[PDB]
Structure 1
Amino acid sequence: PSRKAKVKATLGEFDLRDYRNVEVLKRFLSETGKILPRRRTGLSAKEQRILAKTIKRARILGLLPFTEKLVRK
């Protein structure tokens, strides 16, 4: 069911526009650098259109990765 836990509840509050909040914005990527599908995140219609141009910001400034490779795990 993909019914693990969306990342909206696994945190206190925060701002979606503070690019270098990388503790949080690591849990909005995958085991690739891919911005988590809206179903995983559980973000609003506004919210993940914001968190979109955020991790596109906090990428150019190196902080958050463009892609990874893969752990067979």
Structure 2
Amino acid sequence: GRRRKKVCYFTANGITHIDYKDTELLKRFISERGKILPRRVTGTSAKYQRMLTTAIKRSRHMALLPYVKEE
């Protein structure tokens, strides 16, 4: 396969980003519930997927992101 999601959205980004400088790209990285849109339905390679995920999870720990978001 395999079961990742769309790429080439980095037409104005890449290869490594951001970590936090655009809350709006992170709005599209994963879900808004605090839960994580998986790498299955996010897409970028496990290197970049993992780095973006740890960025967003830090933002959670950084209060830039809610750990869990309510409704």
TM-score normalised by the chain length of structure 2: 0.66
CA gap of 1:41–1:62, structure 2 versus 1, over 3 A, is: same
CA gap of 1:29–1:36, structure 2 versus 1, over 3 A, is: same
Contact 2:33 2:68 in 1 (8 A): yes
TM-score normalised by the chain length of structure 1: 0.64
CA distance in 2, matches of 1:31, 1:17: 18
- Structure 2 residue 3 is the aligned partner of structure 1 residue 6: no
- Calculate the aligned-residue CA RMSD, in Å: 2.5
CA distance in 1, matches of 2:12, 2:34: 23
Report what 2:34 is aligned to. 33
**What are the ranges of 5 or more consecutive residues in structure 2 without an aligned counterpart?**
none
Instruction: Decide which structure has greater helix share.
Output: 2
Q: Percent identity?
A: 50
Moved over 3 A (4+): 5-8
